[PDB]
Design a protein around this ligand. Structure first.
Ligand SMILES: *[C@@H]1O[C@H](CO)[C@@H](O[C@@H]2O[C@H](CO)[C@@H](O[C@@H]3O[C@H](CO[C@H]4O[C@H](CO)[C@@H](O)[C@H](O[C@H]5O[C@H](CO)[C@@H](O)[C@H](O)[C@@H]5O[C@H]5O[C@H](CO)[C@@H](O)[C@H](O)[C@@H]5O)[C@@H]4O)[C@@H](O)[C@H](O[C@H]4O[C@H](CO)[C@@H](O)[C@H](O)[C@@H]4O[C@H]4O[C@H](CO)[C@@H](O)[C@H](O)[C@@H]4O)[C@@H]3O)[C@H](O)[C@H]2NC(C)=O)[C@H](O)[C@H]1NC(C)=O
Ligand SMILES: COCC(=O)N1CCC(c2ccc3c(c2)C(=O)N(CC(=O)N(C)Cc2ccc(C#N)c(Cl)c2)CC3)CC1
Ligand SMILES: [Ca+2]
Ligand SMILES: [Ca+2]
Ligand SMILES: [Cl-]
Ligand SMILES: [K+]
Ligand code: NA
Ligand SMILES: [Zn+2]
Length: 805
């Protein structure tokens, strides 16, 4: 119930929402069927449209008009945005030359530059170039301010998950808005763009910017807008709020446009019908900037022009149907379209089998345009698992395609030519970022970055302390003239031990054998020096990683590699080695095929054992430093130390061996040397964070040797590839991966072929940021470089995507 019989007189677009059954006059009242009887009349004026004309100049104020051209309109804050242009001979903002904004130039009473966030739905990155001729206001913001060539959305590349990620700095698995529609099995309820369910605050986790601002005494405009409020009225409303008294005026404002997404769905991303919506959004930017310039705020406000995701060509005829794969298609519920999520139609059904559903969907047709995954097996870079609203079964759909349950679902809803929701690495899903104002840099291009980073920046722009989030604060300092944020390295929690030779061979009963008893004063001092860390500056180029949790570990030095060996997990946490452009690949000699050697620096009780591997018929082992890349036949013996061994499924060893034998050397050749840091990851509860020992669900049979869920590598070289990795004077270049440690290669449909036909494709799919590895390991990398910490934070957030240009 609402008693809608009160009035909006003097309350139009009030900032504080009043509680039922009192009637409302705020920008959301329409959506709730709760506005006062006179809201349309008083608050949604439309008479005479949105522009001043010559004949309206200096008119007698008529309070019925949409906006005003009367002399008193500047005082009242309610002129048409072009008033000064038409009636006072001023120029439109877009026609002014651009001039550096070195300091904020704000009216008296402004305590800080306001932030206006102008969000555009479906605004694909390449619109900036391709629509440049029809978007002069946007193109001015872009060339004069700070811009990226594109901004990476979060997965799924849908509207609500991305807008709410922009507001919170959180992955959708953390904020809870995991799709445009979602079912919560605990609420037994579904969230959709339509209807009232989305209104309940129970769906919306984290702390969005408006709440962060309010808690810290910074006032915030409403970020949600009722769809029927036209754009011109949203702009006028922002400009009116900006004219409020100092104690009442918000410092942060949001404008949202449903375009170009709305037309993009109908016409495709580059349909000829798309020119007009781009012109119309540009005109709305023009209105805002002219409006700001009238209020003398155009060199005071920081403006962010940001999109939520792009748009791809997608038609009804490119739909894969599940009824073409499954027989029990009526026992499932599918969230369809540009991603798939499958769950049981009934929870009272104990004969529903996720395993058999997955198998019936795997590599079934040679051209198949989707891939099924258990959610925990999805690429870690998607961060799309740790929420009860994400179904166990996930389908990653190829760009340009849809998935649906049955044909009747498509014709009983061709409508559409565009859609979005695909993997956030896809070029067509990339969106835009422009920042313009006194706190942003002038005429500056920044590298592409992820939208999860922007919350920290918007907090910096507002003098706010951000709530805990998934951004890496400091990684976008290079966007800002001032207000940076001064990041500092996390303190190391565990310091390493440096063990010497402490154990005789015969103290070990590891059930290991090696053919290594072949017997010089020149080269015995030499080997001693190597074990003490003589070559460490060659193989550890950026300092040892810091361990950020409490544990017991040893640094072990070798001629060819250095490692941080965990006495708790019985294996290295990290192994670091450099491979120069000139390095040679060798074989594992025949006599050394099954060689594993006790490490006399490490106790029998903190070592793995070969017997466990012999007894575990599913589990084999591999090595973190590859024996193929030994510097000499003598150094090769170090590669077979028990302290370099890790548990590996035979299926995974195919992947790993190819990476180590072929790919590392290829990268060293291409990049002029590489430094590699490799190691295990344990994430059995799929939360993206390092497992404690008591979370491990799988051990090597009859041992305390834990089985990794993933293996990582971070591959660093010089950005200036004329300099070798080990003698690099300037910025660095990195690519990294987090490979799932799986007992089959069901994910790679061509895995029956030679590794040269599928391994690198798998690794590319599982590309990662250094920061993703840091969360999963509790390690902190690049502790000792000649580069600024802000720069290193940018480096740690980089993702190598392997998309074309
Ligand atoms: C991305 O950034 C985010 C933000 O920093 C990181 O997420 C944080 O991760 C922390 C560790 O996982 C986590 O801390 C836990 O908080 C528990 C209290 O949580 C509530 O309060 C906070 C703060 O206001 C709130 O944000 C939480 O919101 C979640 O849940 C609501 C619904 O209740 C959702 O609306 C919302 O979207 C959000 O959901 C997400 O997080 C939860 C987990 O909290 C997931 O389950 C969801 O799927 C979704 O992802 C909560 O309202 C606190 O109880 C925990 O403490 C336990 O563990 C420690 C171990 O040291 C122990 O000392 C404690 O005693 C306690 O153990 C006891 O409880 C156990 C569990 O019930 C039990 O088994 C034990 O036996 C004990 O009795 C813990 O500190 C923090 O909440 C989230 N924050 C957010 C916003 O998600 C995220 O990790 C980053 N991602 C990456 C990859 O880096
Ligand atoms: C914790 O916060 C929850 C809250 O305060 N709520 C109260 C408001 C209620 C509500 C009420 C009414 C509506 C809508 C939501 C609603 O979604 N639309 C659609 C819509 O605005 N856009 C598509 C654009 C949009 C703009 C910004 C963001 C963001 N960040 C997002 Cl995600 C979307 C308009 C109608 C939801 C719950
Ligand atoms: Ca959208
Ligand atoms: Ca974990
Ligand atoms: Cl969805
Ligand atoms: K075995
Ligand atoms: Na396969
Ligand atoms: Zn859309």
């Amino acid at each position: 119930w609402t008693a809608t019989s009160g009035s909006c007189k003097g309350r139009c677009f009030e900032l504080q929402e009043v509680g039922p059954p009192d009637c409302r006059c705020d920008n959301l009242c329409k959506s709730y069927s709760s506005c006062c009887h006179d809201f349309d009349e008083l608050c949604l004026k439309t008479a005479r449209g949105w522009e001043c004309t010559k004949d309206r100049c200096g008119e007698v104020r008529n309070e019925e008009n949409a906006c005003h051209c009367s002399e008193d309109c500047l005082s009242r804050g309610d002129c048409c945005t072009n008033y000064q242009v038409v009636c006072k001979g001023e120029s439109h903002w877009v026609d002014d030359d651009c001039e550096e904004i070195k300091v904020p130039e704000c009216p008296a009473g402004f305590v800080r530059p306001p932030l206006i966030i102008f969000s555009v739905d479906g605004f694909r990155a390449s619109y900036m170039k391709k629509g440049s001729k029809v978007m002069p206001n946007i193109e001015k913001l872009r060339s004069c301010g700070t811009h990226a060539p594109y901004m990476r959305p979060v997965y799924p590349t849908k509207t609500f998950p991305n807008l709410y990620t922009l507001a919170t700095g959180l992955y959708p698995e953390s904020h809870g808005i995991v799709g445009n529609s979602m079912y919560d099995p605990v609420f037994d309820a579904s969230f959709h763009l339509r209807g009232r369910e989305k209104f309940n605050h129970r769906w919306w986790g984290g702390q969005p910017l408006w709440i962060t601002a309010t808690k810290q005494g910074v006032r915030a405009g409403t970020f949600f807008w009722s769809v029927s409020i036209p754009h011109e009225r949203r702009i006028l409303t922002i400009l009116q709020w900006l004219s409020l008294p100092d104690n009442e005026r918000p410092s942060v404002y949001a404008f949202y446009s449903e375009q170009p997404d709305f037309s993009g769905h109908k016409y495709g991303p580059f349909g000829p019908e798309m020119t007009n919506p781009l012109r119309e959004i540009d005109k709305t930017v023009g209105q805002l900037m002219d409006g700001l310039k009238q209020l003398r705020l155009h060199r005071c406000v920081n403006v962010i022009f940001v999109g939520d995701h792009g748009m791809e060509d997608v038609t009804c005829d490119r739909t894969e149907f599940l009824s073409n794969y499954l027989t029990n298609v009526d026992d499932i519920t599918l969230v369809p379209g540009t991603l798939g999520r499958i769950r049981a139609k009934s929870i009272n059904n104990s004969k529903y089998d996720p395993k058999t559903i997955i198998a019936a969907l795997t590599c079934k047709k040679p051209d198949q345009h989707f891939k099924p995954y258990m959610k925990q097996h999805l690429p870690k870079r998607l961060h799309y698992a740790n929420n009860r609203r994400i179904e166990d079964i996930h389908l990653l759909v190829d760009r340009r395609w849809h998935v649906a349950r049955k044909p009747l679902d498509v014709y009983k809803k061709c409508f559409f030519q565009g859609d979005h929701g695909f993997d956030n690495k896809v070029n067509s899903m990339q969106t835009v970022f422009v920042g313009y104002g006194p706190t942003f840099k002038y005429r500056t291009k920044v590298p592409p970055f992820e939208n999860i980073e922007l919350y920290n920046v918007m907090c910096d722009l507002l003098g706010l302390k951000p709530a805990p989030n998934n951004g890496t604060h400091g990684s976008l300092n290079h966007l800002l003239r001032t207000n940076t944020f001064r990041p500092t390295m996390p303190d190391e929690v565990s310091r390493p031990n440096y063990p010497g030779i402490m154990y005789l061979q015969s103290e070990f009963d590891l059930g290991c054998t090696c053919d290594d008893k072949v017997e010089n004063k020149l080269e015995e001092l030499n080997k001693r020096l190597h074990t003490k860390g003589s070559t460490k500056e060659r193989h550890l180029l950026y300092g040892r990683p810091a361990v950020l949790y409490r544990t017991s570990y040893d640094i072990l030095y070798h001629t060819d590699f250095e490692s941080g060996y965990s006495e708790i997990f019985l294996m290295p946490l990290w192994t670091s080695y450099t491979i120069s452009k000139q390095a040679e690949v060798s074989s594992i000699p025949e006599h050394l095929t099954n060689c594993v050697r006790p490490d006399v620096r490490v106790s029998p009780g903190f070592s793995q054992n070969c017997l466990a591997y012999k007894n575990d018929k599913q589990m084999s082992y591999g090595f973190l430093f590859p024996p193929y890349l030994s510097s000499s036949p003598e150094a090769k013996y170090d590669a077979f130390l028990v302290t370099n061994m890790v548990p590996m499924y035979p299926a995974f060893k195919r992947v790993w061996a190819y990476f180590q034998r072929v790919l590392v050397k290829k990268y060293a050749s291409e990049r002029n040397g590489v430094n590699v840091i490799s190691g295990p990851i344990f994430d059995y509860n799929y939360d993206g964070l390092r497992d404690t020992e008591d979370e491990i669900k799988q051990y090597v049979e009859g041992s305390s040797i834990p089985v990794p869920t993933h293996y990582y590598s971070i591959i660093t070289s010089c950005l200036d590839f004329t300099q070798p990795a080990d003698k690099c004077d300037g910025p660095l270049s990195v690519s990294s991966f987090i490979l799932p440690h799986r007992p089959d290669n069901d994910e790679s449909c061509n895995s029956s072929e030679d590794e040269s036909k599928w391994v690198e494709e798998l690794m590319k799919m599982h590309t990662a940021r250094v920061r993703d590895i840091e969360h999963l390991t509790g390690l902190d990398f690049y502790r000792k470089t000649s580069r600024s910490y802000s720069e290193i934070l940018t480096l740690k957030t980089y993702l190598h995507t392997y998309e074309s240009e």
